[PDB]
Structure 1
């Protein structure tokens, strides 16, 4: 049956949640909503509860809400943020106006833990292994993160990791900002229709930073960042130039003085040669030629962690809704069906 709900004001907004969730405390901002820590008395888990802000105020918002719920409901993997619960105080579709999403409460994001700090090779191995393990799963469902960065990697005290905010402005991408430093050049500069390996570029940037304690490509703007990238990996050859479908972007790239790829062993001085090799395979300008998550897990760098029988893939994920044009109430009804049909994990 329907649980008993109780009301509380937290972020100058009234939160209405089932009794099972106790000791609500603000954590901060989440994607498209605010997040509270809580204790789930039913499972004994410390949980993060996100209340979506105005989830059905427009078509964009309504579809966005449906999108996030569909994504979270699908993801069932140790290294990916999944859905422990989803609820609404609404008793019917006509009353339906709020959506609350529940997942594991994590200790900190990777950024807050590692900033300015050089990690030991074993710690890097374990962290990157988990990211790749989660990404293999995400990619197998034909989902792309698109925005992978340290702040979207949630980690506990024992370094257990989960990927947050997968599959989801111009101002926040401007200037000397971490929001752009981990982005593949093809997505940063709209070169072409990009693939799953945009995420692998991001993993390369994250891995380098864990190994050195320094941002790999701390560009002051898009152009400065491109220059930093091209200095390391070399200017594109004729082969990649043809794949840049944007005539304007292709034309600009051609104006740059050619540079050869640098020696990664001279860039990452002292690093495990296996780590250097993997970075070389991740940080390839031509996305067609980048290592995949599945391939990277089999790389000798992860010898102590790799297990082909314990690196699962996802069930098929139907995202035909993405190409669908619907009204607010139609997206709302689809979302409502997904809320009501939710079955909690074991």
Structure 2
């Protein structure tokens, strides 16, 4: 057991191992209770997160367990990983607080996309890295569900990682970036969705890196659907059959039919190979979208593609998701995952 020390950070008593020095808050509350620190064991600048109210309800206790299981699994160059997890508790009986430690990057994609001139080579390398990380995430049967520029971290060499492993009705309402990258089948609860929702999001991100502009900046759910159908066309009878929501199917049929637009006339002057890949990602029927594994072999990525260095994940057991347990049973499972942590090489 390391020696712990105490200090007051943001109205809060933090108790951390001596290896972590110079703690100072970051994110202005956006990430939760998170501080930058210097890690004296590794020499890295790190992020230390102190969970708030981790075991306050059955729902909160299960969310704590889910977050720690996902972060312990993810071991890939293009995905956030866990450097450490600790508690100052010396037994299950006195366990209350959980702290998570990760690498901390320089900025998110929103900072670069808003403030930089991006070449076609920059767009090739950034989207290649998102797809390499997604091939790994999807191989474990994990769905991200929230890919957007604020969840993609980058360092000065243009190397990228995927963040955020919840959302409320109020959070998805009106003129908000929280909804602009969502696939239409999840935005409007059309059907049981699957991993194809993440490829819609990558298409929206790619289009914005190419133009400097949000692809579908809707003022509300209905305005955003009208922007999507003007580009990709209204649904045909095959996709309408698959909308298992009757009232959603009825509303779609009230709209005048529109053909798919010419993407070379929308993305004026872009690499033809980028236009081709956008046409394969931004397909209304999720069964017909390109997968991450197929997209890595597309000619747009010929400069970066290496089929011997695009790894897949170990198997991930998510059977706990269908399990009904008491608060103390979720808290005991979380404790065992804290004490069993093995740090990376």
Does the pair score TM above 0.5?
Answer: yes
Please list the CA deviations of residues 308-345 of structure 1 after superposition, one character each: whole Å capped at 9, or x if unmatched: 00000000000000001111111000000000000000
C-alpha deviation, 1:9, in angstroms: 1.2
Equivalents in 2 of 1:32, 1:242: separation in Å?
40
Normalising by structure 1, we get a TM-score of 0.97
Provide closer, same or farther for how the CA distance between residues 118 and 175 of structure 1 changes in structure 2, counting only shifts above 3 A.
farther
Equivalents in 2 of 1:103, 1:281: separation in Å?
34
Equivalents in 2 of 1:64, 1:152: separation in Å?
19
C-alpha deviation, 1:25, in angstroms: 1.1
Provide closer, same or farther for how the CA distance between residues 202 and 118 of structure 1 changes in structure 2, counting only shifts above 3 A.
farther
Provide closer, same or farther for how the CA distance between residues 93 and 30 of structure 1 changes in structure 2, counting only shifts above 3 A.
farther
Q: Give yes or no for contact 1:68–1:168 (8 Å, CA) kept in 2.
A: no
Equivalents in 2 of 1:235, 1:4: separation in Å?
62
SS at match of 2:25: strand
Provide closer, same or farther for how the CA distance between residues 168 and 314 of structure 1 changes in structure 2, counting only shifts above 3 A.
farther
Partner residue of 1:110? 109
C-alpha deviation, 1:116, in angstroms: 6.5
For structure 2, the 5+ residue unaligned runs are: none
Q: Give yes or no for contact 1:143–1:167 (8 Å, CA) kept in 2.
A: no
C-alpha deviation, 1:157, in angstroms: 1.0
Equivalents in 1 of 2:16, 2:28: separation in Å?
18
Please list the CA deviations of residues 275-297 of structure 1 after superposition, one character each: whole Å capped at 9, or x if unmatched: 00000000000000000000000
Equivalents in 1 of 2:94, 2:177: separation in Å?
40
For structure 1, the 5+ residue unaligned runs are: none
SS at match of 2:265: helix
Normalising by structure 2, we get a TM-score of 0.98
Please list the CA deviations of residues 179-212 of structure 1 after superposition, one character each: whole Å capped at 9, or x if unmatched: 0000000000000000101000000000000000
The answer to whether 1:66 aligns with 2:65 is yes
- Greater than 3 Å deviation, 4+ residue runs: 29-33
Q: Give yes or no for contact 2:79–2:133 (8 Å, CA) kept in 1.
A: yes
C-alpha deviation, 1:168, in angstroms: 8.8
What is the count of residue pairs matched by the alignment?
A: 345
Equivalents in 2 of 1:76, 1:186: separation in Å?
30
What RMSD, in angstroms, separates the aligned Cα atoms of the two structures? 1.3
C-alpha deviation, 1:167, in angstroms: 9.5
Q: Give yes or no for contact 1:55–1:62 (8 Å, CA) kept in 2.
A: yes
Please list the CA deviations of residues 83-106 of structure 1 after superposition, one character each: whole Å capped at 9, or x if unmatched: 010001111111111111111011
Q: Give yes or no for contact 2:128–2:296 (8 Å, CA) kept in 1.
A: yes
SS at match of 2:171: coil
C-alpha deviation, 1:117, in angstroms: 5.2
Please list the CA deviations of residues 213-266 of structure 1 after superposition, one character each: whole Å capped at 9, or x if unmatched: 000000000000000000000001100001111111111111111100000001
Provide closer, same or farther for how the CA distance between residues 223 and 168 of structure 1 changes in structure 2, counting only shifts above 3 A.
closer
C-alpha deviation, 1:166, in angstroms: 3.2
Equivalents in 2 of 1:137, 1:220: separation in Å?
34
